[PDB]
Amino acid sequence: ASDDELFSMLDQRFGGGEDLLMSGDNGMTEEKLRRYLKRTVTELDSVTARLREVEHRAGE
Amino acid sequence: ASDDELFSMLDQRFGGGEDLLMSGDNGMTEEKLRRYLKRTVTELDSVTARLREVEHRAGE
């Protein structure tokens, strides 16, 4: 499966909707793996971090 | 900060506890970034995905 497909899911979550052209000029694989991964672990850690409380407090 | 520090938390979340030696023999940065990124994306896309319902349904 194309890596872009997975990264696409992040494109919307990390910053869905915009105006400026996304364009593209990544040096290699790491370049993309740098921002998406560094961000993913944090986002991944974020959802899980709040998820523990979300189930507890919840919301009407 | 070392990348492993970030990939470590993922190590426990992606599969905490085991038996077989983790070892190590990654070609470069990508190699690690290949699994950790691709995973954390859906991983974050997962928690984020259920969190929306968790707040709602929650649990006694």
The upper half-sphere exposure of residue A9, i.e. CA atoms within 13 Å in the direction of its Cβ, equals 21
Instruction: Give the domain range for residue B1.
Output: 1-60
Q: Which of B59, B44, B34 is nearest to B13 (CA)?
A: B44
Chain B contact present for A56, CB below 8 A: yes
Query: For every residue of A5-35, which 3-state class applies, written as one string?
Result: HHHHHHHHHHHCCCCCCCCCCCCCHHHHHHH
CATH number of residue A43's parent domain: 6.10.40.10
What is the C-alpha to C-alpha distance for residues B28 and A7, in angstroms, rounded to an integer?
A: 20
Structure tokens, B57: 């349904």
Instruction: Give B24 to chain A, closest Cα distance, Å.
Output: 19
What is the C-alpha to C-alpha distance for residues A7 and A4, in angstroms, rounded to an integer?
A: 5
Could you write out the DSSP letters of every residue in A42-57? HHHHHHHHHHHHHHHH
Instruction: Give B20 to chain A, closest Cα distance, Å.
Output: 24
What is the C-alpha to C-alpha distance for residues A32 and A9, in angstroms, rounded to an integer?
A: 14
User: How many folded domains does chain A comprise?
Assistant: 1
Q: What is the DSSP letter of A60?
A: -
What is the C-alpha to C-alpha distance for residues A49 and B48, in angstroms, rounded to an integer?
A: 11
Quick count: other Cβ atoms within 10 Å of Cβ A41?
25
Which residues 6+ apart lie within 8 Å of A57 measured at CB? B58
Chain A contact present for B48, CB below 8 A: yes
